[PDB]
């Protein structure tokens, strides 16, 4: 079945107050496994899941060194972006990068990512062909041309195809117990008085992994009037939670049904009050 390795990296400039803060976080599927945070006295790349802890010093050394190279790159990029955009000096700005690989059942690279944002907006991104770049604007075009001259795409492609998938594979091995689990949601419906005419029904899905789920209300088996659907959220114990609420006329509660689709469900649930 499908899996992903992804890194999320951010530098924020703090002018007059020090060097930009630089953080990189690594995820395998929905699970965080590593970080580097420049805010430390002796910043090192660091484990963030139990199953990474037995990686030897050569792992953390190498990764540290690569994170620190990127730190310097991000400082240069912040300065350059500000120049290319004609922005007033001072001001805090952010540069972000998101990168990694997806695999299917396949263990051949299904998709690779190398994308960047300045101040929270697309700056440049490697397209799905892993050969060409989309520049978000006139500024990022300068960068694209420079990355074209250097042949950066092919270099990233070798990473995406080779080392990225190779290390995802190792990580799934190390974390196989946790990373490979399917926790199916426990769902129920709660009833809350609203007014002499109506009530709220809240459909919950609790304790599920991975995060992806579809949770919905129907009225007479047709889809579905306003519904409140909260953003999927961490329980903090490696499972997720979600609910969807609908305001219903008193005496027609039995008309409405909640539906939950999730990988760990043999058959999608239907709940009714």
């Amino acid at each position: 079945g499908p899996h992903s390795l992804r890194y999320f990296v951010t530098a924020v400039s703090r002018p007059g107050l020090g060097e930009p803060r630089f953080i990189a976080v690594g995820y395998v599927d929905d699970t965080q496994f590593v970080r580097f945070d420049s805010d430390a006295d002796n910043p090192r790349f660091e484990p963030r899941a139990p199953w990474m802890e037995q990686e030897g010093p050569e792992y953390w050394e190498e990764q540290t060194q690569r994170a620190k190279s990127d730190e310097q790159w991000f400082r240069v990029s912040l300065r350059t972006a500000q120049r290319y955009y004609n922005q007033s000096k001072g001001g805090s700005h952010t540069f972000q990068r998101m990168f990694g690989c997806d695999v299917g059942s396949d263990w051949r690279l299904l998709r690779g990512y190398q994308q960047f944002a300045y101040d929270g907006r697309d700056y440049i991104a490697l397209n799905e062909d892993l050969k060409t770049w989309t520049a978000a604007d006139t500024a990022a075009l300068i960068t694209r041309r420079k990355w074209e001259q250097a042949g950066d795409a092919e270099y990233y492609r070798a990473y995406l195809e080779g080392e990225c998938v190779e290390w995802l594979r190792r990580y799934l091995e190390l974390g196989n117990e946790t990373l490979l689990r399917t926790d199916s949601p426990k769902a129920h419906v709660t009833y809350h008085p609203r007014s002499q005419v109506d009530v709220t029904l809240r459909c919950w899905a609790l304790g599920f992994y991975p995060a992806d789920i579809t949770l919905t209300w129907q009225l007479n088996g047709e889809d579905l009037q306003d519904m409140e659907l909260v953003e999927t959220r961490p329980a903090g114990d490696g499972t997720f939670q979600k609910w969807a609420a609908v305001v219903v006329p008193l005496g027609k509660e039995q008309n409405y049904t909640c539906h939950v689709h999730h990988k760990g469900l043999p058959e999608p649930l239907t709940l009714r009050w």
Partner: peptide
């Protein structure tokens, strides 16, 4: 594994 950016912007 983390891979640093190859070339400057």
């Amino acid at each position: 594994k983390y891979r640093q950016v190859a070339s400057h912007v």
